[PDB]
Design a protein around this ligand. Structure first.
Ligand SMILES: CSc1ccccc1Cl
Length: 161
């Protein structure tokens, strides 16, 4: 298990434009295209991302390439963020995957987790797990949030096996 396998489980793989759990146009392994309601706007973002005229459809290789870029962007965003980096650097490798997973899903802005971050940095795992669940995130995607929270609570891959 690694961050790629973990997010591939959580996001699935679809080769044609779809809507995510929030109703936003997406493709591949959870690659957000746009929050605009315009499918044409989403198709333009897709063509820009892939470098060719895609008509809303990509190959598996292209989906995996976008996915690698997206995971890397989440990691680099953590490392550039003065609030997130110290917490991330305090974690073991398995829990770092849970952190990347959250940033992939919600972005750096998706900021309100200050108290959870403090508990995680303090290694108060059960308390952090309780706090993480008091969130729109948990209520709207509870099965995925439960898996991520179990990963933070235990430092194991048990929720994904
Ligand atoms: C909200 S999860 C997270 C994100 C960035 C760095 C560390 C953590 Cl625990």
């Amino acid at each position: 298990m690694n961050i790629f396998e973990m997010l591939r489980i959580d996001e699935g793989l679809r080769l044609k434009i779809y809507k995510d759990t929030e109703g936003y146009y997406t493709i591949g392994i959870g690659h957000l295209l746009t929050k605009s309601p315009s499918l044409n706007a989403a198709k333009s973002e897709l063509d820009k991302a892939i470098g060719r005229n895609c008509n809303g459809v990509i190959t598996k290789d292209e989906a995996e390439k976008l996915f690698n870029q997206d995971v890397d962007a989440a990691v680099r965003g953590i490392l550039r963020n003065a609030k997130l980096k110290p917490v991330y650097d305090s974690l073991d490798a398995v829990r770092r995957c849970a952190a990347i997973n959250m940033v992939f899903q919600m972005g750096e802005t998706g900021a309100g987790f200050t108290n959870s971050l403090r508990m995680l940095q303090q290694k108060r795992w059960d308390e952090a797990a309780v706090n993480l669940a008091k969130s729109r995130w948990y209520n709207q995607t509870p099965n995925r949030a439960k898996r991520v929270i179990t990963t933070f609570r235990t430092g194991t891959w048990d929720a994904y096996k």
